[PDB]
Amino acid sequence: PSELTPEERSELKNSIAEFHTYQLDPGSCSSLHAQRIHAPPELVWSIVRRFDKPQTYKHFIKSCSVEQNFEMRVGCTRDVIVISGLPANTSTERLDILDDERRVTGFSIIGGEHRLTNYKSVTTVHRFEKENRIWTVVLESYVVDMDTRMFADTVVKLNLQKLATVAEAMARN
Amino acid sequence: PSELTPEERSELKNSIAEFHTYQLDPGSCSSLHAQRIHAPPELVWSIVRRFDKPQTYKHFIKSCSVEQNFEMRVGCTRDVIVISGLPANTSTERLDILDDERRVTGFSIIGGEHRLTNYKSVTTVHRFEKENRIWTVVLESYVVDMDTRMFADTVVKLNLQKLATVAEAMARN
Ligand SMILES: Cc1ccc(CS(=O)(=O)Nc2ccc(C#N)c(C3CC3)c2)cc1
Ligand SMILES: Cc1ccc(CS(=O)(=O)Nc2ccc(C#N)c(C3CC3)c2)cc1
């Protein structure tokens, strides 16, 4: 990630090896993106961990539904309807990992009308502290089958930026 | 300013001595405030130098008028009308200093219905760079005659925060 400082890259080497390295299946495409956020990591995590409410920190979502008496645990699902004018209409997604202690979460696409077969994403949230400053870096990686990388990278980048905007609005003193 | 890092305070010592130190007139009150802004200093300066448009980076302004064929130069004035519900109704203000090369500007209150007699403010905009990061610190100080300090400090703080929000919105990639 070309936005991270040398110190940020050094402190994140472990997390990248631990959560963002893939054994690529035949015929795939993977990328890692980073976003610096000037807000406390506990706040950033409280936003991005809400699997049932991706529209609150992502673009392009017309609506997101979950079942009645929804319980956020691995295996739960969400039904996303995409706004018009994109190369996707609907997506059914499954929560793959939720680690509140380590601030790791991830999901997989398991259905829908779109072109991102076998898409799987992992997001991690990281605390930085130096002198009297506390800030966050979010890392998000994906793998997907098979322009494709350009579209998926740009969406992931824009969504990380929305997450940053939301968290920074909430963190204002 | 308790928000600045030790490194920021060290690099700003010169500017504080140069632009933000006062020979206090009899019966006064002065304070210095700082705001970190995650945007380029040239962008921050382009916003805050607009003496004719304080409502675009400050709170509490119902309207701000300037004369026809306004020219922004030292001695020009602006007529501010404050929103209702505050200890001030109107303010006439004069541009005291405009230094585009050094990024220093300042103004004085010269009339109006309010309780801030002989209010004078100076704002400076500062570039910071470290590794691949570029950011801004804004310093704003005032002096005013004679609760008063609490009200004026809180307004200056909130306005610096609005400036930060505007600049950071404009700087999004
Ligand atoms: C690249 C990518 C895939 C999935 C998601 C989560 S989501 O925005 O809730 N759902 C979703 C699923 C598939 C696609 C496609 N193509 C999209 C497109 C970004 C509209 C969103 C976000 C970003
Ligand atoms: C403390 C202070 C004084 C002046 C300004 C510039 S302004 O907001 O355009 N005008 C102004 C003048 C006097 C007062 C008072 N009291 C105020 C109050 C903040 C509403 C604004 C901003 C902040």
UniProtKB/Swiss-Prot annotation, chains A, B:
The keyword S-adenosyl-L-methionine does not apply. A motif (Gate loop) lies at residues 84-88. Disulfide bonds: none annotated. InterPro entries: Plant_def-hormone_signal, Polyketide_cyclase/dehydratase, START-like_dom_sf. Abscisate binds at residues 58, 88-93, 115-121, 140. Receptor for abscisic acid (ABA) required for ABA-mediated responses such as stomatal closure and germination inhibition. Inhibits the activity of group-A protein phosphatases type 2C (PP2Cs) when activated by ABA. Can be activated by both (-)-ABA and (+)-ABA. Promotes drought tolerance. Upon interaction with ABA, the 'latch' and 'gate' loops change in conformation leading to a tight dimerization and the creation a surface that enables the receptor to dock into and inhibit the PP2C active site. This is Abscisic acid receptor PYR1. It comes from Arabidopsis thaliana. The lineage of its organism: Eukaryota, Viridiplantae, Streptophyta, Embryophyta, Tracheophyta.
